[model samples]
Target: LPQTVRIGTDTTYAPFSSKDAKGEFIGFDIDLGNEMCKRMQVKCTWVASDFDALIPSLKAKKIDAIISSLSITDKRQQEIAFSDKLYAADVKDKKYFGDGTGVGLRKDDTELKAAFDKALTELRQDGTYDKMAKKYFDFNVYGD
Candidate 1:
């Protein structure tokens, strides 16, 4: 196997995925994707694309996956798959970071979807989710 994954993302989203002074695409999503590829024994090939076109592009096979700061919305759930929430921005309850991660797929790959969900649950319970969330949000909602 080539052991390489093509990630579709917008290179202008700050703090998530953007180019640095050296013109290198790097950020939260980029770093997280790099870690994922490393753990999966694969290489990550980031493919720049528009944010709005991400879902369509993913369905068209333009990219193997979406590493964007996508949310696990009900509407999106009917169209793609997600790995896990690497970061989030909550404004309501202040509990559970941004909704969750959004992994794009062909809308028919149930196996992969199930696997991702399982992996996410394990990561959450194992402290990976907590650690990452804390890094981006205040651990205490209201405190002295």
Candidate 2:
């Protein structure tokens, strides 16, 4: 949105976002963040933030956006606006690690939120979501 969008995220959540053995933040979420910036043609400044702290940090201006796997729900909608549905994991079958999301932002930022929605819709319509879903998951990742 600005010169460089400050993105808040937690690197502890694996598959979605987590640090590697070398203590480097690298995962699908990180890649997705990088890809999103690439698509938007903006620079992304990453910030280490806890999952629960994302909203607080956003309100405090700690970050311009959030790329962490924060789910999009009605409760969340009341607090923030979400980007296009990035990677919706199958929580029902446990196809992913945790129930998180790719789109999350302050509700007031409607323009950006709508842009994400539009982008995601296009991706989904074009079979991008299906391709990713198959690529990222191998089985029903439900429970232990």
Candidate 3:
């Protein structure tokens, strides 16, 4: 049987992850997760969770991965692994939040991390990244 991966997301994080007027999940992170699952040939189930509860939810096995526009931080890196960046912004100081978002996974899941990176790289290289951005956004969100 194909593996079923449950993805955790915080719907309040708009553009990254959010709900539409119909209450259906819709956003960049959600769409990205679906696309990644399709490319990976795996089944995915999305779990809407609280922003502060995402980590605990993952630790409890409620979700296999986090696609909630999570930042890649040293503190978080200790508890979980992050995939290649999906979006990036400029951060001026360590005191402030870092720029960029990535998929979060359990610390030991190296295989899953590699697969996500590979798929993301392919998507960027094939112009799907820019295409999606253009379709959904009016300006460049990825800062140099």
Candidate 4:
């Protein structure tokens, strides 16, 4: 496993990921990402990038993981594997493709994927997830 985890996300998406007055990334995404890395005992760096650039940068190995509310899809699966479902958003469309977000990782990084999964599950059970959710959202992000 890498000593530092470079997690890519867009800083413009508020409530999910965004920058505060200090230019530091802060939001639910940042909260969860940092907590997961804490549980894994790794350095987590939030890499800012255009939303559209995340997948390519990840595939090119420019970042170790993606936490940008990226939807999980079969087409995306062809390029990389994913952590467990983090939450869901319908892209505000009626199509409702059931496309929700997950932490994206390279296809071969199963060990890192496992670590993320384990940490996320603990967050759910330990009330870490709900605490952040209540602070940032009214909608049910659980997607249950």
Best by lDDT: 4
Residues 54-126, model 1: lDDT tens digits: 9888888777778777767888877776655555534345465535555565566565545555655665577
Candidate 1 has what TM-score?
A: 0.71
Order the candidates by TM-score, highest first: 4, 3, 2, 1
lDDT of candidate 3 over 6-122, digit per residue (tens): 999999967778988988888888878888887777899988989899988888888989998787788888888899887763233433333677899988788888878888888
> Which stretches in model 1 have alpha-carbon errors above 4 Å?
89-98, 110-144
* Model 2 RMSD, rounded to 1 decimal: 4.3
Question: How well is each residue in 1-144 modelled by candidate 4, as lDDT tens digits?
Answer: 778999999988888898999999988888889999999999998899998999999999999999987888898999999998887746455355355789999999999999999999999999999988899877667564
The global C-alpha lDDT for each of the candidates, from Candidate 1 onward, is 0.65, 0.68, 0.80, 0.88
- Candidate 2 global CA lDDT score: 0.68
lDDT of 2 at 93: 47
Pitting candidate 2 against candidate 3, the one with the higher TM-score is 3
Clashing residue pairs for model 3: none
Q: Write candidate 2's Cα lDDT for 1-144 as tens digits.
A: 565778888888777678778877776666666655666667877788888998888878778788876776778777777775565444554554354465677777776666556655665577654555465666533222
Listed in order, each prediction's TM-score against the native is 0.71, 0.74, 0.87, 0.92
The true-versus-predicted C-alpha distance at residue 92 of model 1, in Å, is: 8.9
The residue pairs that clash in candidate 2, if any, are: 69-101, 80-107, 81-107, 84-116, 94-141, 94-142
